[PDB]
Design a binder for this molecule. Structure first.
Ligand SMILES: CC(=O)N[C@@H]1[C@@H](O[C@H]2O[C@H](CO)[C@H](O[C@H]3O[C@H](CO[C@@H]4O[C@@H](C)[C@H](O)[C@@H](O)[C@H]4O)[C@@H](O)[C@H](O)[C@H]3O)[C@H](O[C@@H]3O[C@H](CO)[C@@H](O)[C@H](O)[C@H]3NC(C)=O)[C@H]2O)[C@H](O)[C@@H](CO[C@H]2O[C@H](CO)[C@@H](O)[C@H](O)[C@H]2O)O[C@H]1O
Ligand SMILES: CC(=O)N[C@@H]1[C@@H](O[C@H]2O[C@H](CO)[C@H](O[C@H]3O[C@H](CO[C@@H]4O[C@@H](C)[C@H](O)[C@@H](O)[C@H]4O)[C@@H](O)[C@H](O)[C@H]3O)[C@H](O[C@@H]3O[C@H](CO)[C@@H](O)[C@H](O)[C@H]3NC(C)=O)[C@H]2O)[C@H](O)[C@@H](CO[C@H]2O[C@H](CO)[C@@H](O)[C@H](O)[C@H]2O)O[C@H]1O
Ligand SMILES: CC(=O)N[C@@H]1[C@@H](O[C@H]2O[C@H](CO)[C@H](O[C@H]3O[C@H](CO[C@@H]4O[C@@H](C)[C@H](O)[C@@H](O)[C@H]4O)[C@@H](O)[C@H](O)[C@H]3O)[C@H](O[C@@H]3O[C@H](CO)[C@@H](O)[C@H](O)[C@H]3NC(C)=O)[C@H]2O)[C@H](O)[C@@H](CO[C@H]2O[C@H](CO)[C@@H](O)[C@H](O)[C@H]2O)O[C@H]1O
Ligand SMILES: [Ca+2]
Ligand SMILES: [Ca+2]
Ligand SMILES: [Ca+2]
Ligand SMILES: [Cl-]
Ligand SMILES: [Cl-]
Ligand SMILES: [Cl-]
Ligand SMILES: [K+]
Ligand SMILES: [K+]
Ligand SMILES: [K+]
Lengths: 598, 598, 598
């Protein structure tokens, strides 16, 4: 039987005709043509004689997957399915352009991977570096071509085999898309590793329209050797992370792991849930990464995320090289609900909703960060966590605006004394920020706003309490070493009646010509003896800066009343006109709202 | 012809060789192997002799779909397509573990359903309970195994056949995922029923990473027999509902139907549109559901939804059992635009943006709700709807914060007199909340903020009007039965000049040592006869609590001026110093801002 | 060989049996039956003898794609794949119902297109109108049937061939879904054209549940002939655009192109990124489009978008026909970060975050726009861009509310003098709006809030600066031609000490009985000679409207103090009581906060 021989051969399907639903108007095809409309790893997972090899822990699937990608790339692209119901193990490094990236598989343009099954790293990779999927085509990324139109999706899994790092200097990654344009990962679970990143998008600003959506990242740090981790690093513009889940269980992750980093303009991190990490997101312009999309990171969005972290939620920064200065501006952080998970004070990096972070060498004077809006977020830290702040302002800041947040933590504004001395401009804390009471009674010796800066200019701090905290030393304190000019500092009187210090200016900075301030204080006054309208004067001469003051106290007396309002005198006394129904020197201790130019 | 017999047999495709695109480097396969890469209901929808059965209203497809799921489960999973262009009817109950859940189909781990066609319930199910897809494997959920990695997706439809409930005690569901980990429904339309739920995720905190996305839910309540309905019930952590559409047309739905419920930590409801429902979302910690994820519901997010409802948008609650106390905290409700649809006053449950709801037995003293942020929402109710409030505060509340919302309805804060007497702590209504004017002139006999509580502590109400409503009895009223301490209550003067009552304290609660208050009032004053600086005193003695007051009125006179500011006296009179250019007793009725400790 | 002849025929696959994975419990099928579970363009892309035709620039694929759609429609629907690895060119118009829409392909209900390859317009379409995919079935949309359940998705591309418009009156579109119910486009890149729209949803309110998700729109305007462009036009309710990318590079786009328009109730535009466009979104109710969903556009959401534009971000409007009045209400604009891209002043349409736009004939008195909430957005325009405003209020407005935004541009509120004279009601600018300083020192001769209106009622403007701008003429100015009543206008004193004009009322409008105002001013005062309590009077008589004033200045003198507070007198002088320790006439120039009814 000649026909038998043909039909049973690999050419057989090319001899069996087919026409869609027996439609006389349809194309006369061969079965092979229709089968050729799809492709899977099974079509390349064979020995040199063409016999299928079953996958398993004792088989290295790398060369077969690479053969599939290379072939489909040759025919103008398509989608290769990694079949469900099997685990496909990888057990060797790739060659050529990806060798410079410890690469296993080389991605190619217009070739998508539909991962429905599981991909698992074999013990070959224990204690070694690896980047599982690499879209660079040269070991030097500067000399690499682009990866375009490459999408990885499905219900499958990338499993890093649990192996610890061999050395802190090693790098490990899941997907490095490279100089990547229109690439994405959707639906995939990345799990069980000790890695630097799960996914990186772009290279130093080269790339566009790269997205990570509906992915899970689970337990991707597990050792003390791991130097640092960010799950997704976004290093091209017009790119981002949406609707993902990030979880860690290791103690190490609570000290080293961040969920996302946004490093180029028009990038976003939205609608995701994070548990067990140190940090939520870095939002930065590194001068060293400015080649592809310029030296400005603008239009940066962190919105509608949910997080339990141990360190800082959003870290802002920018820095310089010999030839480039990085700028960060036009940032929005909104709709996020974030807490510091239960932990001892000082047992992880300092807790913060916003951190203004010094550069990688510790420099606090290279930053150009401005036009940042932080609005409609909620932040909570347990009462014991001394090291918790709405903002840790540790490096130069050229602007940040807080409106309509709920912050419930130890400090509102903080920087550690005897560390950096930031120059602060255009810091706005609107009165609409609600200050919670979880840390009430825990603030002995502490200043709610602790202004440990070199200087503050064109700034607004409108303090509004919503309950007592009579433990705090002050609502806001400026050390004598902090210059203050062209600024507005106010403390609302509600819940403050029993505080000896509301606002403290240790260098008398509130006396500046262009400082606008109001806060409560207790003042002792004595009157003249005159019957009728009579002056009251303050005993102390500490009020040369006061433009007006008014009573926050009732008058318990019948035969006289102190002034409702006061001005000052050249010698620093307050003075006002009260009323003596009967004559007599009067003496009273009253709570006043002290006002300067407001 | 022996070969003929083989080829035409069910083994035939196993004798036809194939090699992808005639690539010599590809696997030598058989056609059957490639066809085996997919699977559909057609592969199991056959009689006991293997002959295909066409689906239709007179065929029960249940056993065939179950056979497909069971088989694919056996081979490590995959995705079964329910083909487009056909309606597949279900006409009997399933057996075994799902019998305890009125189950039709049993879902199995790692077996996905790609529903491209229609699934329709046959009249067998009329007046009966049913749960169409069940992931429990035991009638007792406590004894059930887990369902993992089960995804239902496609462009198809689940049609509940229109059948009314037979009895109010019956339950009906579309998908019960069970103790569910990494399960999801995407793209599916659920329609034409009278059901309890369309989808439930998790069981009493057991489960994770379950999501409902891009689904439609249309007309799923149609009878008076239906006891209660919530379209999606989220009962496992790290789970949620995103970008869905919910519509009802029945009158019954306007009284009984809610779109989503969030019952465990780290859950979300975002970006969805609701029409025709009673309620938007319950956000609750039931102690009885605390087994799998603990007794705290935290990190609860309701954001960027669009709704026309007839009752309450978000209902908050928590409750207790003999052995567990439920807590609800760290909630954010933001970016939502919501209205009460046109209806008569009191014709549906009381309209509210936020409701603090008593437990299922009516208890108002079992709740532990705090750290809730409601910000950047818009709420509207038509002018006739008396029963509309920004918040109906009906049970104990340990904290809720309102910032930067626009509320345009009858009441801002309300609880019905002669009902519950909530203990309220840490209620914050920031001045940035804009109060609309749709209900201006409709508020005769009514208090905008009607503080019908047992007690209020550590609370802030900053009332700002944006137009007149001279019909209202008061801006805020505290009955004598409401204790008030350590709180800030302010009424801005804008649009209030003609109001006889701005703030009303029926038990003189504003006199408390730690109550901080300011509001306008009209006061009559008379002066002494003295030429020059002269005292003015109030006729009435109702101001022992006032620390300062200032004029909100012009002075129409030429020969004297009343005081700009006043303090008080021990007998409760106000006193201030004005000026008599000419001597004479003066008498004036002036509008004052009365201030206490602010 | 008879069998040979059969097997090699188009009936051959119908003679090769198959049974899934050799399962004895599975259906005995033929290979043809399984192949029939999918369908692609290859099944119809053949000559009249059934021989396949390869696609290419010299082949018109139109009739073959139409044949596929028509056939699948006949069998109750399904999904047709447009295969990857090929470009499929379109080179002629379609016939019948779509001819009235310059249609190429007619979409049919329940027939989806999985576009994995590229679709490209041939030069036939140069200088001509075209709508590539049309879901109308009649040239007159009023007589058209509905398109239902039609989804276009995949990783492919629709390429418009780069051809310029032939005439401004022509229309070009990518997908017109028609009277469209449950239709969507997901994942597709639309590029390289000169078109009116890429996608339109619905027709004059007819349609529902239509969505555009994860699409890219790149370079879709390229000529001066193009009259106007909006990328996605949403003209049915319960529909919207989510997570899309929009980019233009042409100069023309910066003057004519808008990314999205929302024209019916319950529509949304979220989570998208825009670069190179004139405008972000129109949100409008055109009376002429009111047939299918009524004359109210309500529940309109513009959230969490990222944009660099050259004109206006959100344009609001409504208008009338002979028989219908359009209303726009219940709008939310939040979470957006938007800037005007670098450009010269007046080189593109006037820059604005919100524009209240006159109708297409220029009418400013047909609008009914109200209950709009603009909250938690950030807007920036470079310092040189004179024509930049938070809101350009150019037509009648019945309400708009601004809370907790950061606006950094030339004007906050603006309308050009000598143009329209809007009637403004219920405009609310909350104090929580942060006014940036990029345009500080650029505002010579300009008013920050320039109230160029016919009238303002029931409005709130609470101006809060966050730095000096001593160049501006005033913070807020009302021309004499603007009536002002029942409104609250306040200027906070911070950073204003050196301004000669803070608030300017050119028709003395602040004197109205129901106008509530406070702002700083410098006043000269002189006292009587009396030792002791002594009156000070203003030199000028411009203060008949002032209810109280207080000092914003220190007192540099030792022997006297001026009053802390003042009232007025019938002749318009201010008067207050100070203190002369020694007798003598005193004369001082002081900075006062002037207050009226607040
Ligand atoms: C883990 C992480 O993301 N950490 C960031 C930190 O990023 C920097 O350190 C990282 C440590 O892993 C990365 O440096 C390592 O990798 C570099 C890149 O690898 C080479 O190039 C790639 C293409 C190739 O495949 C590899 O084989 C290597 O040849 C190495 O050059 C370097 O020596 C390693 O230490 C990270 O490098 C970036 O990695 C991305 C993603 O792979 C690439 O696209 C970039 O090209 C590459 N960039 C550079 C300059 O090398 C390092 O950038 C971040 O710096 C900090 C940010 O926070 C600090 O800075 C801000 C701004 O001043 C302050 O505000 C903060 O206070 C301060 O903490 O965040 C960490 O989470
Ligand atoms: C319809 C709905 O969601 N209504 C909620 C209401 O939920 C409670 O009543 C529901 C009525 O249908 C459910 O109770 C019925 O179902 C229970 C569960 O079924 C059994 O178990 C399942 C697994 C099995 O398949 C079935 O065969 C049954 O054996 C029955 O036990 C009960 O007897 C029925 O009445 C709902 O039960 C939950 O259902 C989910 C989803 O199926 C399961 O995952 C849970 O295990 C199950 N939980 C329990 C405890 O049974 C009932 O919870 C909500 O209670 C209210 C919430 O609002 C009220 O409480 C809050 C907090 O105190 C207050 O703030 C509010 O003011 C107050 O109104 O919301 C309704 O919409
Ligand atoms: C390009 C764009 O979207 N521009 C809008 C502008 O829309 C109007 O002009 C458009 C110009 O292209 C459209 O008018 C053209 O098309 C019409 C519709 O085509 C016919 O019908 C379709 C079904 C058929 O396939 C075609 O063959 C035609 O027969 C023509 O009738 C008209 O003559 C053309 O100029 C647009 O028409 C709408 O198009 C959508 C989408 O296709 C259809 O669903 C509608 O039925 C159709 N509607 C009408 C009434 O024709 C025109 O609406 C917008 O008007 C403005 C909105 O902004 C202006 O108005 C508001 C509110 O008053 C103010 O606030 C603003 O200040 C002011 O600028 O926005 C532009 O971007
Ligand atoms: Ca390297
Ligand atoms: Ca049961
Ligand atoms: Ca036409
Ligand atoms: Cl200064
Ligand atoms: Cl008290
Ligand atoms: Cl008036
Ligand atoms: K490497
Ligand atoms: K049941
Ligand atoms: K046309």
């Amino acid at each position: 039987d000649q026909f038998r021989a043909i039909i049973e051969s690999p050419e057989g399907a090319g001899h069996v005709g087919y026409q869609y639903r027996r439609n006389t108007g349809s194309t006369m095809r061969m079965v092979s043509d229709v089968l050729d409309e799809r492709v899977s790893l099974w079509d390349f997972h064979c020995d040199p004689s063409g016999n299928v090899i079953q996958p398993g822990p004792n088989v290295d699937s790398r060369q077969y997957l690479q053969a599939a990608i290379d072939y489909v790339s040759s025919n103008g692209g398509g989608t290769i399915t990694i079949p469900a119901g099997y685990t496909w193990y990888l057990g060797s490094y790739g060659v050529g352009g990806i060798a410079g990236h410890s690469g296993i598989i080389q991605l190619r343009s217009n070739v998508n991977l539909n991962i429905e099954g599981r991909i698992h790293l074999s013990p070959f990779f224990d204690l070694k570096p690896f980047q599982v999927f690499v879209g660079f085509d040269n070991g030097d990324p500067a000399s690499s071509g682009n990866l375009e139109n490459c999408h990885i999706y499905g219900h499958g899994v990338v499993d890093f085999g649990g192996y610890e790092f061999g050395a802190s200097s090693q790098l490990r990654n899941g997907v490095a898309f490279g100089r990547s344009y229109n690439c994405s990962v959707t639906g995939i679970t990345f799990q069980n590793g000790d890695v630097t990143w799960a996914i990186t998008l772009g290279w130093n600003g080269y790339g566009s329209n790269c997205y990570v959506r509906k992915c899970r990242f689970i337990n991707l740090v597990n050792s003390s050797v791991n130097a640092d981790h960010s799950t997704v690093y976004v290093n091209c513009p017009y790119s981002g992370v949406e609707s993902c889940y990030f979880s860690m269980s290791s103690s190490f992750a609570r000290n080293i792991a961040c969920s996302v980093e946004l490093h180029q303009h028009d990038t976003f991190y939205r609608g995701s849930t994070v548990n067990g990490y140190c940090r939520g997101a870095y939002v930065v312009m590194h001068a060293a990464e400015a080649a592809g999309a310029g030296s400005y990171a603008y239009n940066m969005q962190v919105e509608n995320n949910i997080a339990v972290i141990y360190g800082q939620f959003v870290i802002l920064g920018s820095d310089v090289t010999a030839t480039v200065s990085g700028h960060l501006n036009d940032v929005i952080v909104s709709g996020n609900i974030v807490s510091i998970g239960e932990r001892a004070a000082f047992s992880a990096p300092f807790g913060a909703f916003i951190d203004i972070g010094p550069d990688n060498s510790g420099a606090s004077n290279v930053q150009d960060i401005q036009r940042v809006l932080v609005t409609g977020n909620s932040f909570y830290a347990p009462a014991n966590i001394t090291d918790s702040a709405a903002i840790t302002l540790r490096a130069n800041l050229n602007g940040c605006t807080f409106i309509a947040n709920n912050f419930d933590c130890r400090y509102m504004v903080y920087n550690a004394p005897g560390t950096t001395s930031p120059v602060v401009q255009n810091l706005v804390w609107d009165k609409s920020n609600v200050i919670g009471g979880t840390h009430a009674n825990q603030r002995a010796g502490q200043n709610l706003f602790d202004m440990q800066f070199a200087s503050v200019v064109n700034s607004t701090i409108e303090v509004q309490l919503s309950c007592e905290d009579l433990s705090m030393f002050s609502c806001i304190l400026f050390p004598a070493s902090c210059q203050l000019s062209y600024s507005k500092i106010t403390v609302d009187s509600a819940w403050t009646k029993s505080m000896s210090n509301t606002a403290v200016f240790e260098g008398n900075q509130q006396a500046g010509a262009n400082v606008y301030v109001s806060y409560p204080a207790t003042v002792n006054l004595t009157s003249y003896n005159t019957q009728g309208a009579v002056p009251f004067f303050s005993t102390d001469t500490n009020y040369a800066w006061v433009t007006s003051a008014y009573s926050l106290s009732i008058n318990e007396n019948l035969d006289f009343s102190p002034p409702a309002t006061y001005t000052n005198k050249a010698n620093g006394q307050l003075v006002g006109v009260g009323y003596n129904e009967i004559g007599g020197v009067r003496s009273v201790s009253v709570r006043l709202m002290l006002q300067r130019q407001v």
